[PDB]
């Protein structure tokens, strides 16, 4: 019984609550600015917040500026067309551990993960399965609030993720999340 330190989680900046709740908005914001423009009543995403804050809307130009330019891969895109759904849970909990199956933290596994997830769930919308909408935003909060939230305390916040890009090169960040995130479509091939 003697706790060196007291309330490391009670009231103050880097809190699990506005982790989770930045996670939850910045996903969702490169969905629905991907979806296409709005609509009213939204009978989808009912009960949950919409694009608003400068800070967070920083963070979406990063991950919009390279969602284009990435989905404009055709190498890329002829990746992922070799793969299927049949189980997107497997391959998501699967191809998703082989992202962190070694070292401990990077940039490649976050972001290419993110991007990975917005086709299941854009992919799910075109389907005519909303309920999978859902269920799949719900996959990736999981990953994130059970793995992605220790780590996320030590760097202060996601002040860290948008201070590493601001580099000149925009070529070695599109490099980055292709190269690492193609290399697991690579071997999910079978085995060889």
Same mark, same amino acid.
């Given at each position: +019984?003697?706790?060196?330190? #007291?309330?490391?989680?009670?009231?103050?900046?880097?809190?699990?609550?506005?982790? +989770?709740?930045?996670?939850?908005?910045?996903?969702?914001?490169?969905?629905?600015?991907?979806?296409?423009?709005?609509?009213?009543?939204?009978?989808?995403?009912?009960?949950?917040?919409?694009?608003?804050?400068?800070?967070?809307?920083?963070?979406?130009?990063?991950?919009?500026?390279?969602?284009?330019?990435? %989905?404009?891969? &055709?190498?890329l895109?002829? &990746?992922?067309? =070799?793969?299927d759904t %049949?189980?997107?849970? #497997?391959?998501?909990?699967?191809? =998703?551990?082989?992202?962190?199956? %070694?070292?401990?933290?990077?940039?490649?596994?976050?972001?290419?993960?993110?991007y990975? =997830?917005?086709?299941?769930?854009?992919?799910?919308?075109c389907?005519?399965?909303? #309920?999978?909408?859902?269920?799949? &935003?719900?996959?990736?909060?999981?990953?994130?609030r059970?793995?992605?939230?220790?780590?996320?305390?030590?760097?202060?916040?996601?002040?860290?993720?948008?201070?590493?890009?601001?580099?000149?090169?925009?070529?070695?960040?599109?490099?980055?999340?292709?190269?690492?995130?193609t290399?697991?479509?690579?071997?999910?091939?079978? +085995?060889?």
């Amino acid at each position: +019984m003697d706790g060196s330190g #007291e309330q490391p989680r009670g009231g103050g900046p880097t809190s699990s609550e506005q982790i +989770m709740k930045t996670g939850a908005l910045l996903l969702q914001g490169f969905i629905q600015d991907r979806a296409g423009r709005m609509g009213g009543e939204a009978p989808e995403l009912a009960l949950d917040p919409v694009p608003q804050d400068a800070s967070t809307k920083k963070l979406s130009e990063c991950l919009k500026r390279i969602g284009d330019e990435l %989905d404009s891969n &055709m190498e890329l895109q002829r &990746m992922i067309a =070799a793969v299927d759904t %049949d189980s997107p849970r #497997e391959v998501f909990f699967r191809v =998703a551990a082989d992202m962190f199956s %070694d070292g401990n933290f990077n940039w490649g596994r976050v972001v290419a993960l993110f991007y990975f =997830a917005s086709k299941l769930v854009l992919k799910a919308l075109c389907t005519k399965v909303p #309920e999978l909408i859902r269920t799949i &935003m719900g996959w990736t909060l999981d990953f994130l609030r059970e793995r992605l939230l220790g780590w996320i305390q030590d760097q202060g916040g996601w002040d860290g993720l948008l201070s590493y890009f601001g580099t000149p090169t925009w070529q070695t960040v599109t490099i980055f999340v292709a190269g690492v995130l193609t290399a697991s479509l690579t071997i999910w091939k079978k +085995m060889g």
